[PDB]
Design a protein around this motif. Structure first.
Motif, short mmCIF file in Angstrom:
data_model
loop_
_atom_site.label_atom_id
_atom_site.label_comp_id
_atom_site.label_asym_id
_atom_site.label_seq_id
_atom_site.Cartn_x
_atom_site.Cartn_y
_atom_site.Cartn_z
N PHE A 62 0.80 -1.24 0.00
CA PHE A 62 0.00 0.00 0.00
C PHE A 62 0.84 1.29 0.00
O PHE A 62 0.32 2.37 0.26
CB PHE A 62 -1.07 -0.06 1.10
CG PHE A 62 -0.60 -0.22 2.53
CD1 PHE A 62 -0.78 -1.44 3.20
CD2 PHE A 62 -0.08 0.88 3.24
CE1 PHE A 62 -0.45 -1.56 4.56
CE2 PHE A 62 0.25 0.76 4.60
CZ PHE A 62 0.06 -0.46 5.26
N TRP A 106 -2.32 -1.65 -6.87
CA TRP A 106 -2.97 -2.68 -6.05
C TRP A 106 -3.64 -3.78 -6.90
O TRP A 106 -3.39 -4.96 -6.68
CB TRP A 106 -3.96 -2.03 -5.08
CG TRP A 106 -4.62 -3.01 -4.17
CD1 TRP A 106 -4.20 -3.34 -2.93
CD2 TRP A 106 -5.75 -3.88 -4.46
NE1 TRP A 106 -4.96 -4.40 -2.46
CE2 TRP A 106 -5.89 -4.81 -3.39
CE3 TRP A 106 -6.65 -3.99 -5.54
CZ2 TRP A 106 -6.83 -5.84 -3.42
CZ3 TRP A 106 -7.62 -5.01 -5.56
CH2 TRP A 106 -7.70 -5.94 -4.52
N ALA A 107 -4.44 -3.41 -7.91
CA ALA A 107 -5.15 -4.38 -8.77
C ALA A 107 -4.18 -5.30 -9.54
O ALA A 107 -4.38 -6.51 -9.64
CB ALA A 107 -6.07 -3.60 -9.72
N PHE A 127 -3.57 -13.31 -15.13
CA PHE A 127 -3.40 -13.42 -16.58
C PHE A 127 -1.92 -13.68 -16.96
O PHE A 127 -1.18 -12.73 -17.22
CB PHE A 127 -3.96 -12.17 -17.28
CG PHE A 127 -5.47 -11.94 -17.21
CD1 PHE A 127 -5.97 -10.67 -16.88
CD2 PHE A 127 -6.37 -12.99 -17.51
CE1 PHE A 127 -7.35 -10.45 -16.83
CE2 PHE A 127 -7.76 -12.76 -17.45
CZ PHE A 127 -8.25 -11.49 -17.10
N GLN A 169 21.33 -5.78 -34.76
CA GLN A 169 21.39 -4.94 -35.96
C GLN A 169 20.19 -3.99 -36.03
O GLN A 169 19.07 -4.36 -35.67
CB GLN A 169 21.50 -5.82 -37.22
CG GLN A 169 22.51 -6.97 -37.04
CD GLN A 169 23.10 -7.48 -38.34
OE1 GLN A 169 23.49 -6.72 -39.22
NE2 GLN A 169 23.31 -8.77 -38.46
N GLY A 170 20.42 -2.77 -36.50
CA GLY A 170 19.41 -1.70 -36.47
C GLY A 170 18.27 -1.84 -37.49
O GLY A 170 17.10 -1.68 -37.13
N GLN A 201 -2.98 -8.95 -8.15
CA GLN A 201 -3.70 -10.13 -8.66
C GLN A 201 -3.51 -10.30 -10.17
O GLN A 201 -3.00 -11.34 -10.60
CB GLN A 201 -5.20 -10.07 -8.34
CG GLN A 201 -5.53 -10.17 -6.84
CD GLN A 201 -5.23 -8.91 -6.05
OE1 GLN A 201 -4.40 -8.89 -5.14
NE2 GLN A 201 -5.83 -7.79 -6.39
N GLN A 202 -3.90 -9.33 -11.00
CA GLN A 202 -4.02 -9.54 -12.45
C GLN A 202 -2.69 -9.88 -13.16
O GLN A 202 -2.70 -10.60 -14.15
CB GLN A 202 -4.77 -8.35 -13.10
CG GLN A 202 -6.23 -8.27 -12.61
CD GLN A 202 -7.12 -7.33 -13.43
OE1 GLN A 202 -6.66 -6.36 -14.03
NE2 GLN A 202 -8.41 -7.56 -13.48
N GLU A 255 -0.49 -14.50 -19.71
CA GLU A 255 -0.15 -13.86 -20.99
C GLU A 255 0.37 -12.41 -20.84
O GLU A 255 1.14 -11.95 -21.68
CB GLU A 255 -1.36 -13.96 -21.94
CG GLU A 255 -2.60 -13.13 -21.53
CD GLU A 255 -2.60 -11.65 -21.99
OE1 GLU A 255 -3.53 -10.91 -21.58
OE2 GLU A 255 -1.73 -11.24 -22.79
N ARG A 312 -0.75 3.33 -4.59
CA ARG A 312 -2.08 2.68 -4.42
C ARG A 312 -2.82 2.34 -5.71
O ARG A 312 -2.90 1.15 -6.03
CB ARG A 312 -2.92 3.46 -3.40
CG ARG A 312 -2.28 3.34 -2.00
CD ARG A 312 -2.95 4.28 -1.01
NE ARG A 312 -2.36 4.12 0.33
CZ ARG A 312 -2.80 3.35 1.31
NH1 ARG A 312 -3.86 2.60 1.21
NH2 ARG A 312 -2.19 3.34 2.45
N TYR A 313 -3.42 3.30 -6.42
CA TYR A 313 -4.41 2.95 -7.45
C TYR A 313 -3.78 2.36 -8.72
O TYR A 313 -2.69 2.77 -9.13
CB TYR A 313 -5.40 4.08 -7.73
CG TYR A 313 -6.81 3.53 -7.87
CD1 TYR A 313 -7.59 3.37 -6.71
CD2 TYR A 313 -7.29 3.09 -9.11
CE1 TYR A 313 -8.87 2.77 -6.80
CE2 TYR A 313 -8.56 2.49 -9.20
CZ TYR A 313 -9.35 2.34 -8.05
OH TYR A 313 -10.59 1.78 -8.13
#
Lengths: 49, 78, 35, 49, 49
Positions: free
Chosen positions: A1, A8-9, A17, A43-44, A12-13, A19, A4-5
């Motif tokens: 914490f 936090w999610a 997921f 090589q570029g 889990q994700q 992938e 935060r926004y």
């Protein structure tokens, strides 16, 4: 914490997921040989040959 | 699946098990500062929950105005 | 989440191609005036 | 060099698209001139009347 | 014509979040690493003596 926004999610994700987590940028231990693919691809602009 | 509620409950059920007891203020204050896991209405109100500073006024004053009632000093005075 | 962003992107891009004449801008009709 | 060739395109990308949109902006100034051409004709006929 | 002129400034502005942020990428990091890796120049000669 500590921050935060959205941060936090992702707790889990970023497990729920796989992938999202799968990329070629792995924790690579194979450094004795995997560098010997990349130093030819280092090589570029390049072609199918 | 994840929500503003799964973020909040991951705090709320975590703070409940911070059990150390005796004379210490912490729960005494928090329960004096009363609100609950189902405060009012329902969780889908969020878009209409947009409000000014006026939301604070009754949380301070609405307990404070009870002093004349609690002490028994006055009641008919609004 | 990537699947849901991807299929909605292609649905939006089909809508744009199905109008064509925008290119998400306004190619065909501009600068016209009246009165 | 692989980064430099990637950085180079962006300077020409901006330079064409800003010029292309000023080719769009100039079209209003030429279309506006019809109003003063009409005004000068609608002016001259009143002195004759 | 004023509504048209807005884009001359707005298109010149709103791109540049792609340059005041994301100002580095993983390839131009390796352009430093393969220079600073010469920290082994404390070791490169010692089997001589």
């Amino acid at each position: 914490f500590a921050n935060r926004y959205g941060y936090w999610a992702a707790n889990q994700q970023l497990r729920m997921f796989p992938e999202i987590y799968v990329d070629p940028t792995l924790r690579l231990t194979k450094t004795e040989f995997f560098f010997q693919l990349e130093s030819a691809l280092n090589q570029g602009k390049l072609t199918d040959d | 699946l994840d929500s503003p509620a799964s973020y909040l409950l991951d705090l709320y059920k975590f703070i409940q098990s911070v059990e150390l007891d005796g004379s210490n203020q912490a729960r005494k204050l928090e329960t004096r500062r009363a609100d609950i896991p189902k405060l009012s209405l329902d969780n889908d109100a969020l878009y209409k929950e947009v409000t000014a500073l006026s939301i604070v006024n009754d949380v301070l004053s609405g307990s404070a105005r009870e002093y004349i009632d609690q002490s028994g000093q006055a009641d008919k005075a609004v | 989440n990537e699947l849901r962003g991807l299929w909605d992107r292609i649905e939006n891009r089909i809508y744009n191609l199905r109008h064509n004449l925008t290119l998400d801008g306004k190619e065909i009709n501009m600068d016209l005036y009246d009165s | 060099v692989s980064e430099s060739y990637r950085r180079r395109r962006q300077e020409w990308e901006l330079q064409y698209k800003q010029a292309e949109w000023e080719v769009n902006s100039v079209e209003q100034q030429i279309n506006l001139q019809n109003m003063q051409i009409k005004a000068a004709n609608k002016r001259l006929e009143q002195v004759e009347a | 014509a004023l509504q048209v002129s807005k884009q001359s400034a707005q298109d010149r502005y709103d791109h540049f979040k792609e340059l005041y942020d994301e100002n580095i990428s993983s390839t131009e990091q390796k352009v430093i690493e393969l220079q600073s890796q010469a920290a082994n120049s404390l070791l490169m000669a010692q089997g001589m003596r």
